[PDB]
Design an enzyme around this catalytic site. Structure first.
Site, PDB file in Angstrom:
ATOM      1  N   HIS A 256       0.861  -1.217   0.000  1.00  0.00           N
ATOM      2  CA  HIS A 256       0.000   0.000   0.000  1.00  0.00           C
ATOM      3  C   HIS A 256       0.884   1.249   0.000  1.00  0.00           C
ATOM      4  CE1 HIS A 256      -3.799  -2.125   0.727  1.00  0.00           C
ATOM      5  NE2 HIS A 256      -2.966  -3.089   1.109  1.00  0.00           N
TER       6      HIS A 256
ATOM      7  N   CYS B   9      -3.676   5.551  -2.858  1.00  0.00           N
ATOM      8  CA  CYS B   9      -2.771   4.378  -2.991  1.00  0.00           C
ATOM      9  C   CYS B   9      -2.286   4.273  -4.438  1.00  0.00           C
ATOM     10  CB  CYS B   9      -3.542   3.106  -2.634  1.00  0.00           C
ATOM     11  SG  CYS B   9      -2.850   2.365  -1.134  1.00  0.00           S
TER      12      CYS B   9
ATOM     13  N   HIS C 184      -3.589   0.026  -5.143  1.00  0.00           N
ATOM     14  CA  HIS C 184      -5.070  -0.026  -4.985  1.00  0.00           C
ATOM     15  C   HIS C 184      -5.672   1.322  -5.391  1.00  0.00           C
ATOM     16  CE1 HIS C 184      -2.601  -1.798  -1.754  1.00  0.00           C
ATOM     17  NE2 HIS C 184      -3.021  -2.921  -2.327  1.00  0.00           N
TER      18      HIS C 184
ATOM     19  N   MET D 296      -9.660   3.645  -2.809  1.00  0.00           N
ATOM     20  CA  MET D 296      -8.708   3.806  -1.675  1.00  0.00           C
ATOM     21  C   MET D 296      -8.219   5.255  -1.625  1.00  0.00           C
ATOM     22  SD  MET D 296      -6.590   1.164   0.052  1.00  0.00           S
ATOM     23  CE  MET D 296      -7.600   0.014   1.019  1.00  0.00           C
TER      24      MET D 296
HETATM   25 CU   LIG Z   1      -3.801   0.567  -0.564  1.00  0.00          CU
END
Ligand SMILES: [Cu+2]
Length: 105
Positions: free
Chosen positions: A39, A89, A92, A97
């Site tokens: 992440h 992110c 993601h 996100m």
């Molecule tokens: Cu993430």
């Protein structure tokens, strides 16, 4: 205390929790990883109340989140401008996100 957003639901998809965030001008916020790394947490220099490039230097971090359960506790400085920040992110990105710190004035 400090705020924390456990990014990643568990049986649904990847999404901060909660999506938005309300903190003070200098409070602290801890971010972590769930079970779908890596992440990336950072604050774009375009989605801010003070389009600049300094408070982020000591706010955004690099390196993938190789820690399962924790990412990086960014202790927002006393310069945190009221309004609403915007972190996201890199991986993601297609999972909503995208959270934002709301520091009332
Ligand atoms: Cu993430």
């Amino acid at each position: 205390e400090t705020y924390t957003v456990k990014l990643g639901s568990d049986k649904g998809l990847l999404v901060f929790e909660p999506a938005k965030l309300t903190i003070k001008p200098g409070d602290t916020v801890e971010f972590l990883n769930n079970k779908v790394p890596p992440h990336n947490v950072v604050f774009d220099a375009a989605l801010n109340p003070a389009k600049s490039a300094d408070l982020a230097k000591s706010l955004s971090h690099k390196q993938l989140l190789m820690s399962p359960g924790q990412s990086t506790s960014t202790t927002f400085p006393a310069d945190a401008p009221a309004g609403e920040y915007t972190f996201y992110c890199e991986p993601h990105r297609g999972a909503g996100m995208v959270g934002k710190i709301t520091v009332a004035g």
